[PDB]
Amino acid sequence: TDMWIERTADISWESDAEITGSSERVDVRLDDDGNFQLMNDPGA
Amino acid sequence: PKEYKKGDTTTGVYRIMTRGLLGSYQAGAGVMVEGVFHTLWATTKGAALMSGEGRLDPYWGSVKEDRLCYGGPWQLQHKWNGQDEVQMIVVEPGRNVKNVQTKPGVFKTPEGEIGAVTLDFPTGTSGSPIVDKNGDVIGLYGNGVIMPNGSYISAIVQGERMDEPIPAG
Numbered sequence: 367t368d369m370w371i372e373r374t375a376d377i378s379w380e381s382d383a384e385i386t387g388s389s390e391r392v393d394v395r396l397d398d399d400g401n402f403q404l405m406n407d408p409g410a
Numbered sequence: 411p412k413e414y415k416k417g418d419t420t421t422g423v424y425r426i427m428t429r430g431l432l433g434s435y436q437a438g439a440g441v442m443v444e445g446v447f448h449t450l451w452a453t454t455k456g457a458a459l460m461s462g463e464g465r466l467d468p469y470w471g472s473v474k475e476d477r478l479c480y481g482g483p484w485q486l487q488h489k490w491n492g493q494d495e496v497q498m499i500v501v502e503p504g505r506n507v508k509n510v511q512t513k514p515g516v517f518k519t520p521e522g523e524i525g526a527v528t529l530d531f532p533t534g535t536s537g538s539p540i541v542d543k544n545g546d547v548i549g550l551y552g553n554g555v556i557m558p559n560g561s562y563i564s565a566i567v568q569g570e571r572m573d574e575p576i577p578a579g
Contacts, residue, residue, distance in 0.1 A: 368428055369437065370460035375423035375507040377441065378545045379497050383509035390508045391499075406507040408425075 375406055418462030419445040419481055423499050423507065423539060426453050439501035441539035441547055446482040449537040450550060450567060454478065476552060476567050483572035488546040490514055490525045490566055496540050498527065498551055503534035514566060525566040530554060540566055 375393050382389035393405045404410055419442055426438040426449060438453025447459065447466055451473050459466040459480060471478035479485070490496060497509045514525040527540070531551070538551040549568030556562055 367458045367460050367465065369454055369457045370427050371424040371440070371447065371466075372427060373418075373420060373422045373442075374425050374439075374501060375499060377421065377423055377443070377499065377539065377541065377547065378509075379541055379543050380509040383497055383511045388508055388510045390506050393507070404506075408504045408506065 373405065374408075374410075412463075413465050415464040416481060417460060417464030417466050419447065419466070423501060425501055425503075426459070426537065428457075436501075436503035436534045438534060439537040439539075439551075441486075441499075441537075441550070443547060444482070444485040446485045447480040448484065448486055448539075448547075448550065449478055449480075450476045450552065451478040452476055452553060453537045470572060472569070475569055476565075477550075477569055483574045484569060485571060486547050486549070486568060487571040488542060488548045489568055490540075490542070490548045492516070492525070494543060496527075496542055496548060496566075498529055498540045499538055500529075500531055500551075501535055501538045502531050515563070517563065517565075525549070526563045527551070527566060528561075528563055530562045530564070536564075 391406045395403045428437045440449030456468045466480035517526045539547045549566035552565035552567040554562035554564045
């Protein structure tokens with residue numbers, strides 16, 4: 367269509383944001399070998 | 411040509427992308443809860459959305475309240491309690507997602523009253539969810555309005571949960 371959506375984060379309160387005011391999220395997916403994909407990244 | 415089916419509705423936070431003349435860009439953000447995608451009316455103005463192997467079509471919206479949802483009725487039910495700080499799950503175009511903590515203010519509506527945040531992010535961030543200490547979505551990041559000093563505040567966009575008739579296939 368004209369537009370589409372891409373999952374970029376989980377929904378959560380983050381402890382580390384509470385402490386410093388701002389925290390980058392750590393939402394990771396792992397392939398078969400244990401390699402990380404960073405969901406939160408705008409280029410993922 | 412199998413776009414006769416409901417697309418992926420995994421719970422989470424999403425970027426809303428679209429095609430321009432020269433490539434793709436982020437039009438907004440939204441939140442998927444209970445198999446329903448929630449965003450501001452202004453981000454898509456009702457356009458259908460591809461998600462995974464299927465489609466999401468607009469289900470209900472209010473232009474006046476700047477609310478729009480796909481795949482079912484408005485599911486978000488929690489509201490800012492008026493005291494606690496909140497966290498915005500900031501989905502800024504071209505940036506990694508971050509949580510930002512902030513104290514909302516109550517600001518003077520003619521038609522009642524509304525919570526607003528002083529956080530100022532680009533309009534492509536609009537529709538990013540705002541959560542309370544339980545991770546419950548208390549609203550969406552609205553489009554900013556200008557203050558006397560030239561700074562911007564943004565409404566916490568939220569309304570009542572709406573009912574769905576019992577599903578059958």
